[PDB]
Design a binder for this molecule. Structure first.
Ligand SMILES: *[C@@H]1O[C@H](CO)[C@@H](O)[C@H](O)[C@H]1NC(C)=O
Ligand SMILES: *[C@@H]1O[C@H](CO)[C@@H](O)[C@H](O)[C@H]1NC(C)=O
Ligand SMILES: *[C@@H]1O[C@H](CO)[C@@H](O)[C@H](O)[C@H]1NC(C)=O
Ligand SMILES: *[C@@H]1O[C@H](CO)[C@@H](O)[C@H](O)[C@H]1NC(C)=O
Ligand SMILES: *[C@@H]1O[C@H](CO)[C@@H](O)[C@H](O)[C@H]1NC(C)=O
Lengths: 336, 336, 336, 336, 336
């Protein structure tokens, strides 16, 4: 009762050429793609890439595989995958894609009487995600995933998402777990590209990432915030205490300087200014300006002590308000 | 007397198809899994994953392999592994699983007269272990290990642990050696998951990890503890010594600041506060507040020196008690 | 109607030897190469190399593959690639070249009735790009890409770019995206090299890279600029304030020192001076010289106070002008 | 005269099954192992592992390979290695073992008339070496190397070292070169282990490593030694010089603090105290205590100046002696 | 006219056994080796290894390959490489050697009528280069490259360099480009080694490397040089300025301390002192001694001010001369 299955498989491969796509010279082969994200791996900002584990699935029609038997489906494994024609799908932005072979090559092959074929494949893709860090860290990144045929133009093989966008891409609840990103949602798109070798259909899946703030708050913003507050303490010290107020300005300015370098060490070496950089510069100005106020006051503490005292007392109030006022504009500007 | 063995093996493979699971269309194939952990590799907190070396073993019944002979068992190696059907077991959370091929592919295959099959396989899994670092470092992590069929639904192939939980998972005494973790114990669990391709049985093994404290004590807590004590020394200095007390506050605050950044460098970039972070903040407040006390005292040392002296003398006692009182609440809160 | 295709392929391979190049002993095999850069990967300055993803394409004539049929072209995949002769092309400067095999080996094979063959191959090359960092960061780097035959001398196999330079190399608009480089343009070149085994033709593709400045401005130049300004503040302080002015000179000089080490940490360990290094040295001299002025003034503040005061007042003006004057010469010298 | 060799090899493989161990069902197969260490690779303390390059050799008896001919030996290469049965030897603690295939798979196969077989194989093992860093750096580590059969229990295959321990393991004079370790010697051991699948013989080779001190002396101890001496200089300064002595204590304490963190950065994240840590703590106490002495003296310099001066003068002598006395106990305690 | 080539190749393989070396049992096989270094890769000092890309070539005589035909040579590729016997050459010190397979395995095979064979192979070797850093950085390193047979003793296979040393090893002009090394020249050597398995011939190629100084000058020496000069400035300050001179000594000593740690971070963890370390120690003594002079002077500024002033004035001259005098001895000692 099992030998029946074996005979059918031999018949299907009898006179079957895997080098020829189904329906060659008769029509255009249609392929349906559905993606299930097993886990959305970490996003390496420095390398401008991300890791993803998916169960990539394809469906298409092959008349040569039509069969009649008691069983309407033929679940199988990688053993028969190489014996028949499969599309030469590849990822344009996939820099290094390697499948999993342990314990067994994770491949599923199913066939129905009508000749429909289902070929689900597991993959891990280190695809690149270019990002415009103009509003970093309050940025919404759109990491795409582009794949298509390598040798079959749009006139021979066509890729189309199955059903709607919701069913086309499925993300596991526990899979979408990142340390510094929120997976807001997913979208799909298709387009044609003309090249030297002809037109090729392209399937693009976009993942909307909303960076979660709070790590940099504990890392960069707070030290800058407290650093500015530390410098303003010098305004409460006597003018004649030249040495004491000198340390406050010198130490704070250097403290801000090292934070600027340290903060960008983890950040990618992008040749443009981010929102964080502007925030650092403002904090640098406050501490730097505070030092100037002391130096200017100390310079005129002899000729006109009266005005010098007014500046010191006035300074204690002006700077905290300006720093507080700036923050509301800053955070409100980006958090909206 | 050895040729007898060779003839039997040829007979078993005579007319045997490895593309068809045993008992197809007659019943549901039952698989028993037992795991022996050769060594529990290091846990990379930054990468939120861990390494494990195990002798994964599976057992199932195949009537096609029934044989009669003087020997009741047929120990073998990887040579015959690929010649017969094996389950397409894979690890859902296994990000990169690679077997060991040196000196020889570590695979064992045994067969009995009844047709029972034993297939033990060695593997090294870089599986991911998501962790909720709300109580870090005093946290108990539950790193799971999920595996199941990739192409055979729950209606065809079923995985079940053999005997009880104790015998199902075995850990070598010397294997469970980690630098910053205690292997409290192991547990097993099974569940069904419904997907587009059908229901699949899932086997989950949970390892209970109790992080061992003491590395961070020598790394983060003690420098913070001594740093707070260092700042309080300024309370024992004369008020007029403005420059001397100034250095204590400035240096200590920056010292705490750098520790906060340095401490999280090894810690993963998680977007939420840990218990250690709260401890750092409190230590920051003490040193920061100590500076305020000196600044406030130095500001009113002219108008009302009497009250200023009282604050200084009172400060020497209040702060150490508060810091000592806080620690008892802190450690007792988490160590319980 | 499909079997016709299968018969033709069998006929082509009937009596076809892939170990013999086409037109052997009759003429010289001519190969046309066209390159399409899918994406210009990051350039690792420390490793003096770069990553590139290209669709390398070759064209040549093979009389043995002449065929007659209804279809004038035979699109195919990697399956037939190994069945026929192909050139042993390799990259001389390619340190580690690995192709992409997922989902399928990205290879295209096309044949026409005349016998023309097109063999496009995807590759990722970690080629080395030697750079002369004499004008770093204002440098224009010319990263080449050299490839040629490994076993067929120039007398047997010849590589020539197809059409002009513009069509020979094509770069995708989104592919040429780097963090700290501008892809100004591309060029091609060919040359013969004589070795022990004979003459071999060489095909060289040069990419002109214009480093984009601005990352180092926020990283190195600005801290140096503000550091120099910070030191000059000591010139506005009273001479008798020995301790206060002492901190300015000491802290600034060390600040410059650490920047010099930190700046070169990311830079490759090149045994020669860059333009940035000279800029750092000048900034070091200003801060260092400022300390000398205070020390010299403090030494003669007793014997001849009159001249000491003149130097201090004069110093406040001389140094800022010299630093400002130097920058115009510096930036203008390289930005031209 | 060469064809004679070819005929014999064909005869040996005629009717030879590599899936059956020699002497099956007649006796227990005996295997002799001899190891020649080509080079003892570096030991990664952080990863708790080491690299080793060896020419692993095995010897056993196979009656099926008995032959008669003019030549008493048959030197060969990897070509015939896969054609005959070989043991499934594997390394229990080998985390990632990969052989060398360039230029050719480094395998030797020799056969004599009696049927004795010699199978030498080159390997590189990233085996793990657990270490008890209780006396670090003055520690003697015993890195083992365990290997045995994966599928053949102790009742079928037995591993035994050949001759004595000296001949069993051979280390090249230039191979045993490490940056921070001395290869004192080697030893061998055998034991039986009972598991679920049966008893398996185990062969263990232990390498005695005596860590060479001197790198940490220039890295950790000396900075601590000079740091303590630097703090004691404050004892030679006048009491009224509050600011000057303040810097000594503050800077030295922070200097010790950063050394503690920096020292353990290279050290593995072990959750227990090492000998170096205790040495650091003592040095921390001296600098910390020195600050207390100044603070205590400065506090009572008004009420009882006489006793304050005695403490300062006495302090200059007590602390250096205690630090010197402690070192003799420390180094002598571990260097014995 | 092409079929003639195909027939000859079939005849050569007709009755040809690749498991038997040529001239077996008749003479000793002689192999000539010539090396062409495509590029001398970077030398990783920390890992004590280097990367090299070479076109390794071998030549030997095989009577079985004698043929007669119109063409006197048979250029080929990797296709026929595995069909015939080749030596089992391996690199003793090669830790990880991997060939290049893209676009095609870079292998050339040529045969002449007499039976001479040429087999050029491309390789990339991460060989280890032990170094004695006694005179670092002014050191001349001799990185070797050892290779030989793995299974054929010296009595069967012999390796000999072809012609003289100049022709034996060839280095491309642009290939020998390193960041911190000069390729002074190359040499070859041969020797016999006796082991358990017999005598094996060894071929050794030595590369003479002259480290280029200048990177450490900008990294370590200059900061130390300026640091010493900075400390000596305190000698020009008034004795009563206790606080000011205190900062100079404290900051400079710590600055030297951090440089010592930072300098060795890139340097390998060698357990012995280098020339740079001695230079650092001397610079440490100057800054450390300068602090002692101030402390000693400040201690006796009351009892005998006259002698204290003499020391200060004398100190300003003695220390710069000693530091200048030391450098001439230092650099001249190693630069000769
Ligand atoms: C691509 O080409 C096909 C040709 O049938 C067309 O139907 C489709 O709309 C095109 N897609 C785009 C995005 O232009
Ligand atoms: C999974 O399905 C099987 C069907 O027989 C059932 O017996 C089992 O209880 C199910 N497991 C769970 C966890 O629901
Ligand atoms: C290389 O040799 C060929 C021989 O035909 C010649 O035509 C060509 O000009 C040569 N190229 C160069 C750069 O000399
Ligand atoms: C292991 O078992 C064998 C059985 O023959 C015995 O001879 C040997 O002594 C045992 N080894 C140990 C260490 O117990
Ligand atoms: C190695 O042995 C051969 C034996 O013929 C001898 O000719 C050669 O000189 C020996 N080489 C050395 C370095 O001793």
């Amino acid at each position: 009762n099992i030998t029946i299955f074996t005979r059918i498989l031999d018949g299907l491969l009898d006179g079957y050429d895997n080098r020829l796509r189904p329906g060659l010279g008769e029509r255009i082969t249609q392929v349906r793609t559905d993606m299930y994200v097993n886990s959305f791996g970490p996003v390496s900002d420095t390398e401008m890439e991300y890791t993803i584990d998916i169960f990539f699935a394809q469906t298409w029609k092959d008349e040569r595989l039509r069969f009649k038997g008691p069983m309407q489906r033929l679940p199988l494994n990688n053993l028969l995958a190489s014996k028949i024609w499969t599309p030469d799908t590849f990822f344009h932005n996939g820099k290094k894609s390697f499948a999993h072979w342990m314990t067994t090559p994770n491949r599923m092959l199913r066939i129905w009487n009508d000749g429909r074929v289902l070929y689900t494949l597991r993959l891990t893709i280190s695809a690149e995600c270019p990002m415009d860090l103009e509003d970093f860290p309050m940025d919404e990144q759109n990491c795409p995933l582009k794949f298509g045929s390598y040798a079959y133009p749009n006139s021979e093989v066509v890729y189309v998402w199955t059903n709607g966008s919701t069913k086309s891409v499925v993300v596991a609840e526990d899979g979408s777990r990142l340390n510094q990103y929120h997976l807001m949602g997913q979208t799909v798109g298709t387009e044609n590209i003309s090249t030297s070798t002809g037109e090729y259909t392209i399937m693009t899946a976009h993942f909307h990432l909303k960076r979660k703030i709070g790590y940099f708050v504990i890392q960069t913003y707070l030290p800058c915030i407290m650093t500015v507050i530390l410098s303003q303490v010098s305004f409460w010290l006597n003018r004649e205490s030249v040495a004491a107020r000198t340390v406050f300005g010198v130490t704070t300015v250097l403290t801000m300087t090292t934070l600027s370098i340290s903060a960008r060490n983890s950040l990618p070496k992008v040749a443009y200014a981010t929102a964080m950089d502007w925030f650092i510069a403002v904090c640098y100005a406050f501490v730097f300006s505070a030092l100037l106020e002391f130096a200017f006051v100390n310079y005129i503490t002899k000729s006109q002590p009266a005005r010098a005292a007014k500046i010191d007392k006035m300074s204690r109030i002006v700077f905290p308000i300006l720093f507080g006022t700036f923050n509301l504009v800053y955070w409100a500007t980006y958090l909206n």
